[PDB]
Amino acid sequence: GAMAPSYRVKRMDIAKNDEECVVNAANPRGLPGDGVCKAVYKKWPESFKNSATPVGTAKTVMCGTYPVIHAVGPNFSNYTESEGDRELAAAYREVAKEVTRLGVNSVAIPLLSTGVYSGGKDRLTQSLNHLFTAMDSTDADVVIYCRDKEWEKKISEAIQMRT
Ligand SMILES: [Cl-]
Ligand SMILES: [Cl-]
Ligand SMILES: [Cl-]
C-alpha cells in the first residue's frame, strides 16, 4: 500500500503513466478500439491476449510484468441511463478488486464511459463519483488521466473538496 494513499489528476496520455499498473478503458471484445484503448494497445499490445470481458467487469493481462486492467464501461448509446449507471459503478468495483489483488502501490485510471461511450453526455461527475466509491477503500495511490484542461481543473477541484 501507499504510505499516505492519495488521489491526483494529470492531463497527459495514460500510456505515459508513472504508476505500477494501468486501467484500460476497454471494449468488451479486446479490440484495439479508439481513444485511451488505442493508446493502451499501441503501448502494451501483448496485454490484449484474451482480454475480452463483459460490460461491468475488469480483466487483467500482464505485459511483461506490467499489469493492464481492462475495465469495460457501458456504452450509454446502448444502455438506459439506469442500467448504464449500474454497469459503470460495477466496472469500477471490479477495478478496485484487481488493484487490491495485484498488491500494487499505485494505479493510473481514466474516467470510464466519458469518451465515445458517453452517449454524447458530460459524465465527468458520474464517472468520477463511481471511481471514488470503488477506490476509496483501496490503499493504492490513484492517478487519474484526462486530456481536457477544463476536465483537469474540475477533477482536481473534486479531489481537493474532500481533503
Ligand atoms: Cl502526453
Ligand atoms: Cl469511453
Ligand atoms: Cl478528458
Side-chain angles (χ1 to χ4, degrees):
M3 281 310 102
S6 67
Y7 291 105
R8 295 168 57 232
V9 58
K10 300 200 299 179
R11 189 186 74 98
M12 58 175 281
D13 188 356
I14 197 170
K16 303 209 255 181
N17 74 77
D18 196 30
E19 288 69 61
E20 292 182 357
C21 66
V22 71
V23 175
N24 184 23
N27 59 73
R29 302 183 181 274
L31 291 158
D34 333 298
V36 168
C37 187
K38 177 52 63 53
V40 168
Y41 184 73
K42 291 198 173 133
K43 184 58 63 172
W44 306 283
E46 299 93 336
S47 75
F48 289 68
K49 189 164 183 210
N50 296 305
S51 64
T53 197
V55 171
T57 76
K59 185 168 194 180
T60 300
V61 183
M62 309 300 290
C63 176
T65 73
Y66 189 79
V68 181
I69 306 168
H70 296 277
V72 184
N75 183 356
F76 280 95
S77 291
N78 294 336
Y79 284 88
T80 61
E81 288 289 342
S82 177
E83 193 69 16
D85 182 72
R86 191 190 70 66
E87 290 293 9
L88 179 52
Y92 279 118
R93 292 187 301 274
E94 298 303 304
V95 166
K97 297 175 188 174
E98 282 299 280
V99 165
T100 299
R101 184 181 65 77
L102 290 163
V104 293
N105 287 342
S106 63
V107 54
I109 317 192
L111 297 186
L112 301 177
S113 296
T114 66
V116 298
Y117 280 11
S118 75
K121 295 209 178 157
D122 174 343
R123 299 182 184 273
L124 189 170
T125 299
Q126 177 178 24
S127 186
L128 181 60
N129 282 340
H130 286 323
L131 186 163
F132 287 153
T133 295
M135 300 306 294
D136 279 351
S137 66
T138 76
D139 63 2
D141 281 338
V142 169
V143 184
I144 300 164
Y145 286 75
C146 70
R147 298 310 286 274
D148 182 272
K149 281 182 188 191
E150 292 310 298
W151 280 43
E152 183 189 11
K153 286 184 201 144
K154 280 184 275 195
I155 296 164
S156 184
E157 289 164 351
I159 294 165
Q160 288 324 128
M161 283 305 302
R162 335 171 78 210
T163 64

